[PDB]
Amino acid sequence: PYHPSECCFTYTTYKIPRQRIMDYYETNSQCSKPGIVFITKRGHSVCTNPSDKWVQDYIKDMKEN
Template sequence: MKFQILFFLLLLTCMYPSVAQGSYENCCLNYAKVKKSIRRHIVSYRMQETDGGCNIPAVVFKLKKSKTICVDPRLSWVQQVVQKMKE
């Protein structure tokens, strides 16, 4: 009986780190270098803030073919696109 409890506790201890590591955030790690002409393919966007596991601010654009790109929010054309999509 004691062996079963000890084995169970050992099993839980081994499983805990793998469960904790499985929760990755969907973060941009760097900016894509894209041309302004990409604008016509943008479907939606989301803002990435520098909190949690994300270490750079970014605008994440979702494109027509379910692709995503991360761009620098300080770029003027990016700000224009975001402003247009808010309207």
């Protein structure tokens, strides 16, 4: 219960090609900036702005229900 939290302090400016993306999560509400971290198929974690349309579109398309 004392695990640290992941926060984003900068955001990628490039659109990560959709075919390279596996997973995402939203950073902790307590972080000082909003953040969506995408995890690629190779295992890299990339901070992105939740307010970018491509971010929102990827998240929509990744819905599993």
